[PDB]
Each structure stands twice: as structure tokens, then as C-alpha cells.
Design a protein around this ligand. Sequence first.
Ligand SMILES: NC(=O)C1=CN([C@@H]2O[C@H](COP(=O)(O)OP(=O)(O)OC[C@H]3O[C@@H](n4cnc5c(N)ncnc54)[C@H](OP(=O)(O)O)[C@@H]3O)[C@@H](O)[C@H]2O)C=CC1
Ligand SMILES: NC(=O)C1=CN([C@@H]2O[C@H](COP(=O)(O)OP(=O)(O)OC[C@H]3O[C@@H](n4cnc5c(N)ncnc54)[C@H](OP(=O)(O)O)[C@@H]3O)[C@@H](O)[C@H]2O)C=CC1
Lengths: 299, 299
Amino acid sequence: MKAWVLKRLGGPLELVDLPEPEAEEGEVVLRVEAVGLNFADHLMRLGAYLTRLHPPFIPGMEVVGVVEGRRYAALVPQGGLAERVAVPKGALLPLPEGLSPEEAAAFPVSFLTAYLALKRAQARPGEKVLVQAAAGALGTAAVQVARAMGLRVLAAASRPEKLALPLALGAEEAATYAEVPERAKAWGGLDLVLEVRGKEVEESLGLLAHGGRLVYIGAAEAPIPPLRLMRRNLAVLGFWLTPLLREGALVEEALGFLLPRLGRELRPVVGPVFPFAEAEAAFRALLDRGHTGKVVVRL
Amino acid sequence: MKAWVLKRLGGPLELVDLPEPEAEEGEVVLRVEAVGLNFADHLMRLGAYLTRLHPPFIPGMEVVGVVEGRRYAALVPQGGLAERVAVPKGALLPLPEGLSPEEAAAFPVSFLTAYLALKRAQARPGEKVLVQAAAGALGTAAVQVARAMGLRVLAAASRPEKLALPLALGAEEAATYAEVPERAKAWGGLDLVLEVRGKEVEESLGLLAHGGRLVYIGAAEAPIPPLRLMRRNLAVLGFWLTPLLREGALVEEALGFLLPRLGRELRPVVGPVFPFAEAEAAFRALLDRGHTGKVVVRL
Ligand SMILES: NC(=O)C1=CN([C@@H]2O[C@H](COP(=O)(O)OP(=O)(O)OC[C@H]3O[C@@H](n4cnc5c(N)ncnc54)[C@H](OP(=O)(O)O)[C@@H]3O)[C@@H](O)[C@H]2O)C=CC1
Ligand SMILES: NC(=O)C1=CN([C@@H]2O[C@H](COP(=O)(O)OP(=O)(O)OC[C@H]3O[C@@H](n4cnc5c(N)ncnc54)[C@H](OP(=O)(O)O)[C@@H]3O)[C@@H](O)[C@H]2O)C=CC1
């Protein structure tokens, strides 16, 4: 089978021929159709992700493919950008009939992250939540899931032209980063903040209302002075999806809320779609702050 | 006052100084803040609109400005691209508090057109409607209004990258023109079609289910063989907003449904916003098939 391999951190991807995957007991080999790219994939190539993968390896953790006729979505540690991948049957996500490969590849990571982050921050119906990078994969998902949980969503992005999408998905208001503080004052403070920037975390805590909680989801772009936290009984939550995945209960509850809605109230925003042969281009797209939606590679 | 004048059809706009408008009994002079541009404005410059305006004149029919403190939206025959305009008090649209000038300028024409076109075609809750140019001013409005009336919306645009917005506003499915027929077959035919293209009208009637009606809203891009109509009891409706405006009952009913929702379930999509001095650039934007949303000039 053909597959892209990363032989050295910081190096280039090499499209090579490899042996067909072997399925151990409890596993199935699925024929890959689409792979959704994540910022984590980028951090992994540089050797900067929370989990340090040892080269050589096959990039891609979010796959969508076919198993004896049925199409699935699954999160694998690696081996995504290949024609075939072995997957523990118990990790397979069922999909609604018709759901496209491109739309399925933009679901797992973004929606599970959005839901778990809000659940962990105990988001209650009615609360105000600020979603940053609101026009991206994780952002566009969060907006929908937040609306599905009945929260008021204040969307933020780095460019004015990216604000229309979030506003269309349900954001009550939308603003560029420079204008967030003002919208924050008008809203009377935020109950929740999904931090994917990381550079202005302190400035973020200043937007929180009493008992507000900031979920630290990423530092894609600094300390947090424990004291500003006390005055308003604020909370900061570090967050990383991977570990959570190994918790049946959580996963179950999460899917119990997401799957029934997948394709209905929750629709993943597909962004740039690249052919298998343009994997490097797709990776670059991840870094293009002009793009919106999920970057997807189609086989 | 400063104002842009069109002295010759097909000619350029000239930014000139003119006398302050005079308010006759029943009128008010409002201080313009934003003017929304329409395709009709473009057709008028070339002398191709249903209503033939005689030069010289001031382009702009959709204004938003202030009157003794209160901000309004109003449809005037001309005089939009000027610092001030006289308007019959009875034509003034009230706006929800806070509604931005740019967002108010994208409401009147698009939403009234979308609503009246659907009402005239007797769109009933549950029916399937195909909205073309679904990522533009008239398109993005129609999608929302259709959803507000409970219809299933199949959105169509000329480019793949424009489909995300419509899908986000509520479109059940979205497709590029070339792929419409197929989606049409899967849906089992369309009950309604808002035709803004005009070039493929025949091909459009073939997408209609029994008793379906096609609303002819524009020919922005050919005859309609009366016989294909009979076999399925289809209907074709010519449509032009202007005349309708002179009908209190209609206008009243229309606003009675739109205003309460303006800013809530109905949010105008603001697109390219140009400064007063770039009026010509804004006009060009109207013709750029890359743009999405309402073209707006801000004073
Ligand atoms: N903790 C976890 O387990 C998880 C964390 N994430 C985090 O999501 C973020 C990106 O996710 P995906 O990659 O899913 O995202 P998206 O598609 O959201 O892309 C990232 C977006 O982040 C915003 N951003 C702000 N600053 C930068 C910057 N300096 N460089 C690049 N992007 C920037 C940009 O939007 P704009 O232009 O509007 O600012 C950009 O489009 C990362 O921080 C990633 O680590 C995602 C899943 C799980
Ligand atoms: N009958 C009436 O009284 C009214 C008619 N209209 C009609 O709406 C249409 C445009 O409205 P506004 O101007 O409000 O629209 P938008 O912002 O919708 O712009 C027009 C859109 O129409 C689509 N289109 C298809 N072919 C062309 C073409 N050859 N040239 C330019 N655009 C094209 C394009 O979208 P894409 O790239 O996705 O194809 C484009 O963005 C016109 O046909 C206008 O006459 C509007 C209000 C009232």
C-alpha cells in the first residue's frame, strides 16, 4: 500500500510503498477514504505535541474508511495517510447514512473536543461562551455544540471576513480579537472561554464574570497569576483530548449526545480538500490563517 | 452635501457637491450612514432595469441613516449615495436597538424580496426550495427566511468554497450548479425554485415536482416552453419587488413577519464594506462572483 511517512521530525513527508497492515484479534483493516488534519499533526512533526511520537511514522490520526461495506470514522494514533489502516473494532464511529467522507473526517476530534471541553467546564444552558478561532475546525464545531447545549456564543476570529461563518452557525455576536474586550463588556462578562490562542490568557481571565471558567485547549499562537482567579472565583482548566479517549464512560456519554445530532443539528464545516498526492500542501493549509473549516485529504 | 452622481448611463460616477435636500410635507431628511448596493443599481447604470431612471441621478436605493436621534432603514428611488436624503416618513423602517448600520443596509431589499417571493409562491411549511446564488445578499436572506417559514432549503452557488455559508445558515444540503440536478433527484423534486440566474430556466423546470412553482426573480447571467408546465401542473411567476412596495397590506404583512425576527432568527450577512470614497469599487464588487454577502458602502 502507498503511504506518506515522516522519517525525521522537522523533515519532509515521503510518499512510499509499505506492506499491507496486519489485523490482530479484535481489529479490522479499513480502506481509507478521507483523513482530517489537525494542528496536533503539525505539532507532532516538529516534536512538540503532548504525546511524543517516535519517527519514522505515518501522520494522520483522524480517518474515515470502509470495512466490509460499511463506512466508519475512527481515531488512530497514527497510520492515517495510508491506503489502509488497522483499527480496534471498538474504536469505530458509526456514521449516519449518506454522510460524506469529507464531512465525516471533520467530526471526531473537533466535536469530541468541543463537547468534552464544555462538559468538563460544566457549561449550563443559558451561559455565555467565547469561542476563539471560531471559523476553523475546532471553532466551527464548538459554536454548534455550544448552541446544541443552549449556550450563548460570542465568536472571535483574527480576520473580519471570517466572522460570517460563525455568525451563521449560531453565534449571537461575532468579533475580531481586537474587539473582543468591548463585546465582553456589553455581554456583562463571560461564563466560559475556550482558549486556543494561549498568548493572551491573562487578558482572557479579565473577560470572565464571577465563577467563570476558562478552558485551556491550546497555545497555537504565558503564565496565569493565581490571584486574579480568587477575586472572582474563576477557574482555569488544562485540556487534552487524547487521555480522555481512554475513558469509556466519557466517550459513551459524549457520543450519546453527538451521534444522534451528527448530520442534523451538528454539521462539520469542511474546508480545503486536497488530493492524497498534495499532503504537504494540506499541512501548509493548516497554518494558513486565511482558511476556514476542516482541512481534509481525500483518497 | 457631497454625493455621487451618474450623469450618463454606462458612464462613470462623479463625486460632487450638491444642495442640501429639501423636505416636503410628510418627509424627513435623514443623515446617511450606510447604503446597501443591489444588482438593480448596476442594471440601472446601464439602463437595463425594469424601471428606467433618467440621468443625471444619484445611485443608491437602500439607505440607513439618522433622524433626530433615531436610526432607520428606508427604500428610496434614488439619492442613496449622498450625505443626506429626503424620505416620506411612512417609508421608514424601524430597527432593533443596536442593529449596526452595515447590517441594517443589507436587510430591506433582500429580505422583503425573499419573503414576498415565497409568499407569492405560497410556500407551505415542509416544502423543498432551491435557492440559487445562495451565498449572496438575496441568497443568504432567502435561506434564513425560508427556514423561518419552515421549508427545506437546497442551496446552490457557482463555487465550492461559497457553499459553507448557506449550509451554516440552515440549508439542508448545498451544491454547485453543476451538481444541482443530482441533489434534485435525491430530494424527489423541488416544490419551489427561486430563479436568479435565468439562463437555465428550462433545466430548472425539470427539477420541479408536481405542482411546483418557479419564481423568476432575475436574469443576472431564454423562453419557457408552456407544455412542460402542464404535465406536472407547474407554475412560473415573474417577480419584481418595486411595484409590490406600493401595497400597504403586503408591506404590512411582510414587515409583521420580518421585523420581529430581524436581529434574532433573521440576520443579514454583511459582505464587502467600502468607504464612501470607493463607491466605484463597491459597484465592481457586485459583479465579483467571488464575493459573498451584501456589498455595503459606509459613510
Ligand atoms: N487540547 C486538545 O486536546 C486539542 C487542541 N486543539 C487546538 O486547536 C487549535 C487548532 O485546531 P485545528 O488545528 O483543529 O484548528 P482550526 O481549523 O481551528 O485552525 C486553527 C485556527 O486557530 C487560530 N489561530 C490563532 N493564532 C494562530 C496562529 N498563530 N497560527 C495558526 N492558527 C492560529 C486561526 O484562526 P483565526 O485566524 O481566526 O485566528 C486558525 O485558523 C490548536 O491550538 C490545537 O492545538 C484541537 C483539538 C484538541
Ligand atoms: N426581481 C427583483 O425585484 C429582485 C431581483 N434580485 C436579483 O438578485 C440578483 C443579484 O442580487 P444582489 O445583487 O442582491 O445579489 P447577491 O449578492 O446575490 O449577488 C448575485 C449573485 O448571483 C449569482 N450569479 C450567477 N450568475 C451571475 C453572473 N453571471 N453575474 C453575477 N452574478 C451571478 C452569483 O453567485 P454564485 O457565484 O454563487 O453564482 C452572485 O454572487 C440579480 O439577478 C437581481 O436582479 C434582487 C432583488 C430583487
